[PDB]
Ligand binder design. Sequence first.
Ligand SMILES: CCCCCCCCCCCCCCCC(=O)O
Ligand SMILES: CCCCCCCCCCCCCCCC(=O)O
Ligand SMILES: CCCCCCCCCCCCCCCC(=O)O
Lengths: 338, 232, 218, 264, 57
Amino acid sequence: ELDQLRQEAEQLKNQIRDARKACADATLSQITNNIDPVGRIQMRTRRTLRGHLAKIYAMHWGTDSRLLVSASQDGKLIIWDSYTTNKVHAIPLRSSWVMTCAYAPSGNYVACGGLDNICSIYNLKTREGNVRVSRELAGHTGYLSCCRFLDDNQIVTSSGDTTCALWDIETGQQTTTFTGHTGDVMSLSLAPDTRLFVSGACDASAKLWDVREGMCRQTFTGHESDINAICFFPNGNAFATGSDDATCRLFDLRADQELMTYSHDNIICGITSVSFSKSGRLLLAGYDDFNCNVWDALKADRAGVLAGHDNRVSCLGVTDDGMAVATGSWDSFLKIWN
Amino acid sequence: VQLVESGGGLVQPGGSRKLSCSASGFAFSSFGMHWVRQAPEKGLEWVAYISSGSGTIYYADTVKGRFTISRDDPKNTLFLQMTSLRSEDTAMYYCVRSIYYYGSSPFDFWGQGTTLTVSSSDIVMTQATSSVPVTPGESVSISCRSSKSLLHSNGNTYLYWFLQRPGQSPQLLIYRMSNLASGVPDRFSGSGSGTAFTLTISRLEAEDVGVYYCMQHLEYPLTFGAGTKLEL
Amino acid sequence: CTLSAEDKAAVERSKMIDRNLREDGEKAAREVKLLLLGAGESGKSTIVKQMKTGIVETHFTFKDLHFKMFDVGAQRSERKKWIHCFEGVAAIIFCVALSDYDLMNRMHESMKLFDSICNNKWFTDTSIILFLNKKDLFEEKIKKSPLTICYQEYAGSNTYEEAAAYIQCQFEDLNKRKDTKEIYTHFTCSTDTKNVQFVFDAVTDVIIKNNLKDCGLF
Amino acid sequence: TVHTAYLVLSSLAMFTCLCGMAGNSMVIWLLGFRMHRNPFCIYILNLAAADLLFLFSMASTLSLETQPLVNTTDKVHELMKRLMYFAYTVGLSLLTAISTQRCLSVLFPIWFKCHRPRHLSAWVCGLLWTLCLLMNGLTSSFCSKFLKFNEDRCFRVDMVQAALIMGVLTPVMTLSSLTLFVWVRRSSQQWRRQPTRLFVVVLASVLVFLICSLPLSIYWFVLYWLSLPPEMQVLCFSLSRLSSSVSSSANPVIYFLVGSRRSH
Amino acid sequence: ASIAQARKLVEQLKMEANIDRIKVSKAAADLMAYCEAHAKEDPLLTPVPASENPFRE
Ligand SMILES: CCCCCCCCCCCCCCCC(=O)O
Ligand SMILES: CCCCCCCCCCCCCCCC(=O)O
Ligand SMILES: CCCCCCCCCCCCCCCC(=O)O
């Protein structure tokens, strides 16, 4: 009956909790002790990108660490040359309500999506001189919150309809759907080997999915509010989540439980974006209090802040070679920091 | 993508004629446009350039003052008006589209060209080879030299390679030092450093036979080199 | 100027892109953005279909003023996540059906939505144009049955005018802060043409207020 | 004595000139290349620049007035006095333009929002600067002793200047502010809560203008067209200078600090 | 579909329960080893000289 199945689920959850607690020999901070801290590291803004005329919700670096795509509420997807602050491209979007944008690892495509519940793929390299929309992936019943290219023909998109999807761009059809995630999933992060991906939702939980199998592998909890940002450790065996709870957490895939928590009592604003540095030594989080915080990932303290924005920092990203970090904000300015 | 150049014909000395190019199949207003010249027996020679949006305009020294270049983006047409046509202006004129942003391929498409017959500081590109015979299936390497270094402070070596088949307009092969173009076979390879450059074909077929030109884009005027002919 | 010939033409392209961005972002500042809200089957379609998938965007014009109204009632997801995207609209057109006072209660759901959205931190200053439509069916129902059959606190008379005034007063009693924003209440029906004029007048008031805020006088 | 009062007024004028120069420097800094999306900021930037020029010119005039005026001064001094005249006139014109723009922003809001030219403030400021420079050139090289020390012709030029200033800027500024006052009190205070801040700042601006900026112009007007004795002429000039200095120093506070929404 | 939802939840919990796990100490050691293995190639950890900084000028 329903009560019997509920009792079985409760017993399974208790067994899972006991198994997770059994293997927690020592805390992460215990091992990362008597180790040289990063120290107060100040990073200055080298470039300021001054084209957007509305709030910026998403930016993505190119794989060459030079091109940079950014989306704004003015219905603009601008591709910048970060070295010279030159605007390489400006794409007018059909729907100005865009909450995500992605850059193809090959560099030939960009993707965007938002409150239209569509994922638009635009081709950057055509025989004509204009950027053309290549595909319109539809099938999500909620707003699109994230999207990431697997290759030139595969893209995984998370929606507010509580499910993720993997698409075939050449046919515009969902090859697989990742369901079973109560509440809107607000972020996703592809593994460096592009074999798995994690997604954090409004149930205050993160889920690890196998792209090939199409089923959830592990579920991680510990937040008491909806998760807005998630990112993968460079190794690929861990990830970090930021939530409206005004805290960040580090989970380990193999240990299958929380490793440590990055928080401070002076911070009462949620995390909009999170990202790692090369070697995964610095966790770069964006907050609603108009500033970004650089935490030492191995420890739990603050390696620094950069601030520099007059409104909420919505998006941030780190280059593939770790040269700089770009931060966008609701004040309509992108800043490259080094 | 197509560029059809119209005008030309027989012109008396000291006269005037208007050359047009009707571009179609691409976003004309986003492309800078060049007029390039080729004498009936000599190589290619750059003539004029107009940027996107009719901004900066450049002319060759040998035609500065008596030539003018304009464009009509709503009509998608490029005009070259010439006055006081001397006897040295009898040649075939090609129209070349050229877009300029990071990672673009300038001079990617060349027009068919039109013939104009009239009755009777610069960087030097030199190619010391011509009429080189080689059997198909072998590897052929040709060389080009420059007056000064084409390498810039930003790291770009502005050297372009063009192949002109017999009876056809030249087509881009390598749009910078070691930068293969789009749609060309992978056997072509550009290389070089500083002032000496080389273009290599690993296994030449019977189709890649013609005249090979090296052009510089470091500064204006854009100077070509004398052709290096390949014979089967 | 320490730039190559290709770099100079790249900067010119960027300048043209900037010029086009300014031109596109200047005609956007001359348009009026309205956020359309309301419960299901609450006459929202009627007021959005006066003249001329996630967000449904409707663009109309009235006396040299361009209005963009974004109906977002088909989201069916967590409103707290995508509601900050509309921080900056001129007004919130909130549609409520008067006849849905006894159909768990539809009117209670409408008041819950109004309380949730009116006191939102993102819409603390934006004005609300409250449309109370299907008033003909409300009159017919009141003639058939008084409001007191479902409502208990209604100690007033079972008259159509009194019941409508009671509903309106209860609805504008749901905003905690009456100084930051002004609630415009309008009674409409299926056959009406004054809705466009009323929203235009409310937008004119908020435009004057925005200008005063720009001066700093307000 | 009267000389003691003159010295006290000169010292006070120096102090308020320093304070106003500092305040206008800050207003120039924060608003310099930012806040320009606001249609009301170009006028405020131009007014801050004009007030800074006026205060600098009068501060240096008072600084050099202590030294004897025989040959080293009295030539740069006259040019700099005319420069302060020019800055005063352009500041008054800019105040009039600011008041008119504020009145138009609420009298015709649809036109101000979707039909007002974007560069209207910039070229209106340019026209004001050009006209003030032209008029003060027609005043300096024509009435000052440096080039043409005329008496009747200088009198006519100064009368034309003062008539223009008073009977053009004063009616336009006062009527625009009164129209804004009445319109806000009638069409806005009847329904919502009274905008007391608007009323108080509009009244403060009008009072500051009329009581402080105008005395210098009326002193110009009454220097001629009358037979005033020279006994209290110095006192009247010092009072007018102090009033104009107070107006120039208080303009940034009531036009930028009060008018601050994008600077937060 | 309460029965179907409960069965799906039970099966998912069973699948997650049988996951092989490793001690947190070893996972933390692996994370530390990765951090110290790639510390040299971390421009944000140690600011690069202006010569090798593409965003410096
Ligand atoms: C030759 C006399 C000049 C007229 C003097 C008045 C100048 C100030 C008033 C007109 C300019 C400002 C009015 C429009 C301002 C605006 O709407 O932006
Ligand atoms: C010398 C500077 C000129 C600027 C002052 C001119 C302002 C003209 C205003 C015309 C408005 C006519 C239509 C108003 C309609 C509305 O209420 O929006
Ligand atoms: C001789 C006096 C010189 C006149 C100076 C003219 C000043 C005009 C205004 C300058 C700043 C204008 C701001 C840029 C224009 C704009 O933002 O629309």
